[PDB]
Amino acid sequence: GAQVSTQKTGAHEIIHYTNINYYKDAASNSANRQDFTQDPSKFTEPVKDVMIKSLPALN
């Protein structure tokens, strides 16, 4: 019941670490700071009709 996952490193320069959970409550686990998904559309493009950057904004 041991998880093996990669660790943060450079771009092009054994980059593995092991984790085990000792407690029966999920709140005791360590921070899951390895997620890097993001989507700015909800705040940058809240319009109904899709607008193309190349075409004029209006007409």
Partner 1 sequence: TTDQMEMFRIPVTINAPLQQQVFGLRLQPGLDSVFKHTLLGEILNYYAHWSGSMKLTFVFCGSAMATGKFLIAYSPPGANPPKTRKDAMLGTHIIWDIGLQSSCVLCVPWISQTHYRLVQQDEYTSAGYVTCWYQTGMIVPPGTPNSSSIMCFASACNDFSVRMLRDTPFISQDNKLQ
Partner 2 sequence: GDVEEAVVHVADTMRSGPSNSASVPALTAVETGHTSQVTPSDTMQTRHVKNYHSRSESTVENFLGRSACVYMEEYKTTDNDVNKKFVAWPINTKQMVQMRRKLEMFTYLRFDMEVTFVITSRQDPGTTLAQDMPVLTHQIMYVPPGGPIPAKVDDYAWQTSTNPSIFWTEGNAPARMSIPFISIGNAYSNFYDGWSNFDQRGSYGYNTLNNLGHIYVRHVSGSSPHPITSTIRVYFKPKHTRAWVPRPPRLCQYKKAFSVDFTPTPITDTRKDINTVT
Partner 3 sequence: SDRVRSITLGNSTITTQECANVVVGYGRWPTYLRDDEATAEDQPTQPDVATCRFYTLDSIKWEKGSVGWWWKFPEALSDMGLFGQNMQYHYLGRAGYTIHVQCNASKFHQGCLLVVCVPEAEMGGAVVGQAFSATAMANGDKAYEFTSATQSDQTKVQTAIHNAGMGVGVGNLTIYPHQWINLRTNNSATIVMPYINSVPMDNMFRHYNFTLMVIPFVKLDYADTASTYVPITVTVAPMCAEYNGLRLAQ
Please give the residue ranges that form the binding site for partner 1 (CB under 8 A). Answer: 56-59
Q: What's the CA gap between 35 and 58, in Å, rounded?
A: 38
Instruction: Provide the mask over 1-40, with x wherever binding to partner 2 is found by CB under 8 A and - wherever it is not.
Output: xxxxx--x--xx-x----------x-xxxxxxx-xxxx--
CB 17 within 8 A of CB 7: yes
Q: What's the CA gap between 31 and 58, in Å, rounded?
A: 46
Q: How far is C-alpha 37 from the chain's CA centre?
A: 3
Binding test (CB under 8 A) with partner 3, winner from 18, 43, 52, 53: 43
**Contacts (CB under 6 A) with ligand MYR, residues 1-59:** 1-2, 4, 18-20, 22
25 touching its own copies, by CB under 8 A: yes
